[PDB]
């Protein structure tokens, strides 16, 4: 008989870098609000 | 959050709109 002492099997486990991983970022455009005095289209009429 | 600005050249700012009366 032989003993597995020296030849024992190996388990594996990755060295995950999640602890130092950057996050996913969401973008939102800062709308030029119409609540603030934004301009409007100058629909014109004629006084005949 | 943090602010970002687009380098969009004026040439790429042109838009055309097609629609119907309703």
From Swiss-Prot, chain A:
Glycosylated. Coiled coil: none annotated. It comes from the Eukaryota. Widely expressed. Forms heterodimers with IL17RC; the heterodimer binds IL17A and IL17F homodimers as well as the heterodimer formed by IL17A and IL17F. Forms complexes with 2:1 binding stoichiometry: two receptor chains for one interleukin molecule. IL17A homodimer preferentially drives the formation of IL17RA-IL17RC heterodimeric receptor complex, whereas IL17F homodimer forms predominantly complexes with IL17RC homodimer. Receptor for IL17A and IL17F, major effector cytokines of innate and adaptive immune system involved in antimicrobial host defense and maintenance of tissue integrity. Receptor for IL17A. Receptor for IL17F. Binds to IL17A with higher affinity than to IL17F. Binds IL17A and IL17F homodimers as part of a heterodimeric complex with IL17RC. Also binds heterodimers formed by IL17A and IL17F as part of a heterodimeric complex with IL17RC. (Microbial infection) Receptor for SARS coronavirus-2/SARS-CoV-2 virus protein ORF8, leading to IL17 pathway activation and an increased secretion of pro-inflammatory factors through activating NF-kappa-B signaling pathway. It is linked to Immunodeficiency 51: A primary immunodeficiency disorder with altered immune responses and impaired clearance of fungal infections, selective against Candida. It is characterized by persistent and/or recurrent infections of the skin, nails and mucous membranes caused by organisms of the genus Candida, mainly Candida albicans. This is Interleukin-17 receptor A. It comes from Homo sapiens. The chain holds residues 624 to 671 of 866 of the full protein.
Swiss-Prot record, chain B:
Widely expressed. Disulfide bonds: none annotated. Interacts with IKBKG/NF-kappa B essential modulator, with CHUK/IKK-alpha and with IKBKB/IKK-beta. Interacts with TRAF6; this interaction is direct. Interacts with IL17RA and IL17RC. Interacts with IL17RB. It is linked to Psoriasis 13: A common, chronic inflammatory disease of the skin with multifactorial etiology. It is characterized by red, scaly plaques usually found on the scalp, elbows and knees. These lesions are caused by abnormal keratinocyte proliferation and infiltration of inflammatory cells into the dermis and epidermis. Candidiasis, familial, 8: A primary immunodeficiency disorder with altered immune responses and impaired clearance of fungal infections, selective against Candida. It is characterized by persistent and/or recurrent infections of the skin, nails and mucous membranes caused by organisms of the genus Candida, mainly Candida albicans. E3 ubiquitin ligase that catalyzes 'Lys-63'-linked polyubiquitination of target protein, enhancing protein-protein interaction and cell signaling. Transfers ubiquitin from E2 ubiquitin-conjugating enzyme UBE2V1-UBE2N to substrate protein. Essential adapter molecule in IL17A-mediated signaling. Upon IL17A stimulation, interacts with IL17RA and IL17RC receptor chains through SEFIR domains and catalyzes 'Lys-63'-linked polyubiquitination of TRAF6, leading to TRAF6-mediated activation of NF-kappa-B and MAPkinase pathways. This is E3 ubiquitin ligase TRAF3IP2. The gene is TRAF3IP2.
